[PDB]
């Protein structure tokens with residue numbers, strides 16, 4: 001009956017069995033199934049897609065089509081009634097730095113991107129969505145509810161375009177619509193190096209055989225480097241300040257400029273790559289460009305994997321870490337390494353950890369100038385504030401010394417993202433990321449909240465009283481029930497995010513299960529997992545073991561005061577130490593002596 005593999009959007013299947021290095025595309029990781037976890041393939045389906053017409057149309061598409069006998073609520077109405085709040089006082093996470101937020105976003109961009117469709121980059125269909133708020137084909141606009149303030153100042157809707165799907169660019173009736181993952185499923189620094197050979201070659205410094213990445217030849221972080229500019233026009237980063245006219249950066253990932261701390265994180269990974277490569281070269285003068293690009297790329301991939309699994313995941317998953325991600329037992333070629341469709345929503349727990357302001361700090365970690373603290377919404381697609389307002393060092397001090405927002409059932413997403421989000425082509429700081437998330441859940445054919453509770457062996461509330469006990473919140477349960485009518489219909493993003501956090505974690509039981517399963521799979525299903533025998537030497541792993549975000553800052557900035565534990569909330573100078581006391585990455589176990 002069922003086939004195995006639709007697809008024209010394959011590049012070239014050209015696997016070197018003897019290769020010590022990853023492909024850029026993620027092909028050839030699994031020997032038995034070589035396209036497994038490759039980029040530009042369908043997101044994995046842990047559960048069958050749920051569409052209004054069983055094939056492709058989202059729930060909420062046809063006004064007269066219920067879900068389980070109830071109209072699905074407007075995404076923007078759920079956002080206004082449940083996700084929004086006014087008072088930023090007391091919202092900050094008393095034991096997570098802002099870098100905890102920022103690393104989450106970095107790891108997400110390494111693992112998944114479902115890009116919006118393109119059957120019109122030169123069309124009236126392009127602007128007919130924003131202009132006329134007309135639903136059709138890939139235009140699935142987020143309509144405003146009657147009492148919405150934006151109805152008064154912004155028109156009838158927020159334009160929204162359906163995510164791209166695998167096989168055919170326009171129509172496809174082969175089976176259910178499957179959304180694409182444009183990046184590699186492996187935790188492999190694809191966001192630094194790219195997931196397509198072309199982008200991957202557009203980015204490298206070939207002009208020297210030192211295996212360095214291409215840099216900005218127009219601005220430097222006072223003796224450091226900038227990501228090159230995407231000189232492609234029109235530029236959203238130019239458009240936010242036509243005076244400054246500073247373009248977006250060019251990274252392995254097209255999202256790198258979305259906000260200034262993401263652009264900052266990415267800058268450090270371009271720079272850290274050079275610091276490793278040059279260290280490699282001074283130690284192995286005989287090695288050519290490739291061995292230094294490929295080998296440098298392999299240590300950085302290993303760095304991300306370690307920071308993610310050693311430092312990041314244990315303070316997300318808390319008491320649930322050991323349950324879902326037990327100590328590593330080695331590579332299992334039967335594990336599916338593909339990112340699931342649901343994971344791309346689960347991992348959006350990060351939107352509730354984003355605070356309303358970003359700060360630039362000085363060597364005493366004190367306000368940097370008179371406009372040191374800036375509203376987050378002024379920093380979307382903002383590269384001019386890095387280049388013309390003192391490079392990345394002051395932002396990096398903020399990442400260390402400021403705190404993440406804490407998820408709060410009564411203060412979910414800051415209005416900087418819920419009302420003032422900036423998106424390219426669109427001209428306003430007027431988008432709602434929460435509403436977008438809910439619309440996207442439906443766009444992607446997501447099973448509802450109880451399908452996912454069932455998937456994770458958790459109770460399935462069917463009444464108001466049921467929902468109250470699971471959320472441990474009467475008022476929140478009552479608002480969701482008024483909007484959704486049955487818990488079966490709660491969109492996974494808001495359902496999962498609404499659950500009280502697990503002991504010593506930052507997500508509830510459902511998300512702990514979904515995130516935990518996915519992370520276990522991307523480690524165990526990865527033939528190039530840093531700690532898989534034959535990837536690194538027993539001695540390198542003693543030394544790759546040394547790596548730190550604390551150390552990565554010290555070694556690629558002019559910052560000399562850092563916490564040891566950079567994801568915990570750190571207050572200067574009390575919880576801060578001098579850089580000298582921080583275990584460095586001894587690359588002596590990479591020393592090559594052939595002759």
Ligand code: HEM
Pocket residue numbers: 101102103104105108112113114115258259343344345347348349350351353354433436437440
């Ligand atoms: C200021 C910070 C951030 C901004 C401005 C931002 C913005 C966005 C936007 C605009 C989208 C696309 C929404 C859509 O069209 O469906 C998105 C998706 C996403 N965000 Fe965020 N985000 C932020 C922080 C984070 C954090 C901290 C995390 C995780 C810890 C995260 C995880 C995700 C994930 C997984 C997706 C879906 C990616 C995909 O497969 O396409 N984001 N974000």
Ligand SMILES: *[C@@H]1O[C@H](CO)[C@@H](O[C@@H]2O[C@H](CO)[C@@H](O)[C@H](O)[C@H]2NC(C)=O)[C@H](O)[C@H]1NC(C)=O
Pocket residue numbers: 205207208212213214215216217
């Ligand atoms: C690739 O690397 C070379 C060598 O590291 C870069 O050229 C150096 O950088 C600046 C010019 O921007 C000069 O002051 C140095 O003296 C240059 N050295 C050499 C040996 O050329 C070059 O800019 C990089 N190329 C790109 C496109 O990023």
Ligand SMILES: *[C@@H]1O[C@H](CO)[C@@H](O[C@@H]2O[C@H](CO)[C@@H](O)[C@H](O)[C@H]2NC(C)=O)[C@H](O)[C@H]1NC(C)=O
Pocket residue numbers: 332333334335
């Ligand atoms: C490699 O992973 C596979 C699949 O995740 C494991 O296969 C499981 O085997 C158990 C017990 O033998 C079976 O009951 C299940 O059918 C499989 N797992 C799942 C999730 O359904 C396999 O055991 C793993 N190999 C090793 C050595 O751990």
Ligand SMILES: *[C@@H]1O[C@H](CO)[C@@H](O)[C@H](O)[C@H]1NC(C)=O
Pocket residue numbers: 240241243244384388
């Ligand atoms: C644009 O950038 C310039 C510096 O290049 C700055 O002085 C000015 O305040 C910026 N304007 C806006 C609206 O951001």
Ligand SMILES: *[C@@H]1O[C@H](CO)[C@@H](O)[C@H](O)[C@H]1NC(C)=O
Pocket residue numbers: 095315565567568569
């Ligand atoms: C803060 O988080 C860390 C984990 O990084 C934990 O070990 C520590 O006990 C926490 N501190 C407080 C005060 O709860």
Ligand SMILES: [Ca+2]
Pocket residue numbers: 110111183184185186187188189190191
């Ligand atoms: Ca990747």
Ligand SMILES: [Zn+2]
Pocket residue numbers: 221222223558
């Ligand atoms: Zn400097």
